[PDB]
């Protein structure tokens, strides 16, 4: 008669690595790395992403006429912008401190748009022929919907002096711009006054823009340029404009109703009409794994990103042949 001591074996093939030996077959193991995703862009905790499709952040915010979908947008979980969206600045130009503004959008979940300068209100100047063929809408030459390209009326551009008091108990994103004409002849043609300026002031802001003239390559059929500036106007503070030419006035200014966790995700992908609690640029994640290896930039309740192809822990013991 005898009694032996021994240990478990089974039909498992799962292997794990150690420092001294690799591909060690074990009886039990636990994968801790999530390797899969659904391949779609998706609602996060129910809340839909703002998918700009082919519009850019600038295109949306300036109200490019191709970005009609994104007038009065509902609140979003996160934002999706392509790498090189075609519908950016229709009229050639620059967006001043664009990246610093995009950064602000990571802290923002919802804008509510409001009018501060009525388009009609420009009684002394002409407001309805401030268009270009670079921004076409339904065949006709149009312009950024949120700003007014002011021109002279019966050959006179009198000084503009406008003030807006923020009486909303919110911060307010104000946008405006300046036009940089091609030659001294076009300067006089549009605004008459040979030397012009735009002075914008707030409690903090103390700015004075002047148009710079230069011969430039035709981008989108135009050698003229627009340079757009912005500020956050704090509540109970007034912004003051004064200009004798080349001024792009604000019609609408976005109001910042909700501030939360958001992000500007970069993805060529569209919309799966799916829901998740962890999103990536390549797709969405649904797992209990502590790790994943899909893509570093995620949003929501996510496992930790690593570059590993494999993370498997031995739980059981060396399995015999």
């Amino acid at each position: 008669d005898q009694i032996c001591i021994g240990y478990h074996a089974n039909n498992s093939t799962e292997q794990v690595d150690t420092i001294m030996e690799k591909n060690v077959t074990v009886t039990h193991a636990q994968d801790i790395l999530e390797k899969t995703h659904n391949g779609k862009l998706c609602d996060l905790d129910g809340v839909k992403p703002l998918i700009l499709r082919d519009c850019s952040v600038a295109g949306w915010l300036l109200g490019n006429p191709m970005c009609d979908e994104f007038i009065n947008v509902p609140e979003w979980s996160y934002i999706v912008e392509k790498a090189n969206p075609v519908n950016d600045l229709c009229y050639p130009g620059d967006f001043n401190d664009y990246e610093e503004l995009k950064h602000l959008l990571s802290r923002i979940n919802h804008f509510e748009k409001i009018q501060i300068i009525p388009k009609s209100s420009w009684s002394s100047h002409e407001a309805s022929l401030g268009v270009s063929s670079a921004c076409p809408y339904q065949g006709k030459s149009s312009f950024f919907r949120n700003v007014v390209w002011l021109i002279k009326k019966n050959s006179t551009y009198p000084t503009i002096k406008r003030s807006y008091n923020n009486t909303n108990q919110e911060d307010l994103l104000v946008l405006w711009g300046i036009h940089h004409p091609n030659d001294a002849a076009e300067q006089t043609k549009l605004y008459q006054n040979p030397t012009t300026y735009i002075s914008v002031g707030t409690s903090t802001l103390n700015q004075r823009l002047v148009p710079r003239i230069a011969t430039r390559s035709k981008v989108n059929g135009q050698s003229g340029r627009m340079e757009f500036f912005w500020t956050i106007l704090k509540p109970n503070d007034a912004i003051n404009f004064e200009s004798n030419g080349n001024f792009i006035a604000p019609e609408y200014a976005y109001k910042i109703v909700k501030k939360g966790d958001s992000t500007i995700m970069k993805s060529e992908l569209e919309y799966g009409n799916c829901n998740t609690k962890c999103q990536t640029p390549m797709g969405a994640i649904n797992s209990s794994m502590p790790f994943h290896n899909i893509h570093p930039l995620t949003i929501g309740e996510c496992p930790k990103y690593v570059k590993s192809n494999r993370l498997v822990l031995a739980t059981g013991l060396r399995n015999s042949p």
Partner: protein, 163 residues
């Protein structure tokens, strides 16, 4: 393994023992059979569970990338920002992969240790009342019935009775 039991002096495992990790197999006149050692098995289950949770929780707080945008004349700080984000991923990737590697090895030797300690536990009870065969087995001098076998698994092997 470090402790010499698993794939060592005990050459192989038992497909026939399904109700535990470590245990005994007896053979006498009345029959044979596998019995899992609950205590050593439950200890192994706890030790590994904690190990896995300990590992998960230690990696719980780790670097998270955020997207940041830089224009055409901010190339230096774009590049700084890339190397910073990449740099941390390599570190946290190395940590995870190494920890797994190191603790896997410790996990297998842990199992090896537990078998060996269970074998010695039995060896110490039997003393010179059985032959140490050298393969994990002890061959009794006295006839050992199923209570005598249970007596060994019990921890209650009555040495003075069978000497």
């Amino acid at each position: 393994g470090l402790f010499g039991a698993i794939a060592g002096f005990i050459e192989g495992g038992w497909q026939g023992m399904v109700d535990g990790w470590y245990g005994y197999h007896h053979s006498n006149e009345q029959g044979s059979g596998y019995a899992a050692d609950k205590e050593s098995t439950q200890k192994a289950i706890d030790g590994v569970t904690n190990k896995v949770n300990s590992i998960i929780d230690k990696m719980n707080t780790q670097f998270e990338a955020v997207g940041r945008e830089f224009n055409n004349l901010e190339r230096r700080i774009e590049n700084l920002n890339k190397k910073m984000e990449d740099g941390f991923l390599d570190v946290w990737t190395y940590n995870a992969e190494l920890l797994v590697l190191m603790e896997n090895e410790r996990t297998l030797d842990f199992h090896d240790s537990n078998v060996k300690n269970l074998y010695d536990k039995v060896r110490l009870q039997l003393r010179d009342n059985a032959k140490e065969l050298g393969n994990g087995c002890f061959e009794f001098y006295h006839k050992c019935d199923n209570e005598c076998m249970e007596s060994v698994r019990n921890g209650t092997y009555d040495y003075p009775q069978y000497s």
